[PDB]
DNA sequence: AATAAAAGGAAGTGGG
DNA sequence: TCCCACTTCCTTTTAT
C-alpha cells in the first residue's frame, strides 16, 4: 500500500505528470502543483487507492496537512507549494 | 472585486 | 477491538 507522500515523490522523481506537478527547487525539496491541471493528478491518486468517491485536490490537500510541520510533506506559504523532508 | 486556496473538526473507511 | 493513513463532508478563514 503506497502512501501519499511516496506517490508524490515518485511522480516528481520520474518526471511523471509534469504539467500537474513540478519541482520548484529539487535541492530544498520544494514542489508546486498546477493551478489548472492539479485535479487530474488528484484523480490518479484516488484510483491507486481505489476510493469510492472521486479524489479531489481539496481532499488530497486535507491529507497532506496531516503530516504536520515537521513531517513527510509540509506546506510552504506560497500558492500550491509544498516541501518534502530531508528524505530526498 | 471575484475567485481560489487554505484551513480543520469529526465521523467514516480499509488496512494491519 | 486498537491505531494507521487517509477519506469524506462541511463550514470557516485567508490569499490571489
CATH number at residue A30: 1.10.10.10
Whole-angstrom distance, CA of residue A74 vs CA of residue A88: 14
Give the resolution to one decimal, in Å: 2.3
Nucleotide lying nearest to A36, CA to C1' measure? B4
Whole-angstrom distance, CA of residue A38 vs CA of residue A60: 10
Q: Count other C-beta atoms under 10 Å from residue A60's C-beta.
A: 20
CA–C1' gap, A73 and B11, in angstroms: 25
Question: Three-state SS across chain A?
Answer: CCCHHHHHHHHHHHCCCCCCEEEEECCCCEEEECCCCHHHHHHHHHHHHCCCCCCCHHHHHHHHHHHCCCCCEEECCCCCEEEECCCC
Method of structure determination = X-ray
Burial of A77 (0-12, 13-18, 19+ CB in 10 A): exposed
Burial letters for A22-37: b for 16+ Cβ neighbours within 10 Å, e otherwise?
Answer: ebeeeeebbbbbbeee
CA–C1' gap, A15 and C9, in angstroms: 33
Tell me the backbone φ, ψ of residue A84, rounded to 5 degrees: -75, 165
* Cell output for A31: 514542489
In strand B, which positions have an atom below 7 A from any protein CB?
4-10, 13-16
Whole-angstrom distance, CA of residue A84 vs CA of residue A37: 21
Structural domain boundaries, residue A70:
4-84
Domain count of chain A?
Answer: 1
CA–C1' gap, A59 and C1, in angstroms: 28
* Look-up of cell digits 496531516: A66
Q: Count other C-beta atoms under 10 Å from residue A14's C-beta.
A: 9
Amino acid at each position: 500500500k503506497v502512501r501519499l507522500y511516496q506517490f508524490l515523490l515518485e511522480l516528481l522523481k520520474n518526471g511523471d505528470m509534469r504539467d500537474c506537478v513540478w519541482w520548484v527547487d529539487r535541492e530544498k525539496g520544494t514542489f508546486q502543483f498546477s493551478s489548472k491541471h492539479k485535479e487530474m493528478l488528484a484523480h490518479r491518486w484516488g484510483m491507486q487507492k481505489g476510493n469510492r468517491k472521486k479524489m479531489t485536490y481539496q481532499k488530497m490537500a486535507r491529507a497532506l496537512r496531516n503530516y504536520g510541520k515537521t513531517g513527510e510533506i509540509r506546506k510552504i506559504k506560497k500558492k500550491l507549494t509544498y516541501q518534502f523532508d530531508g528524505m530526498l
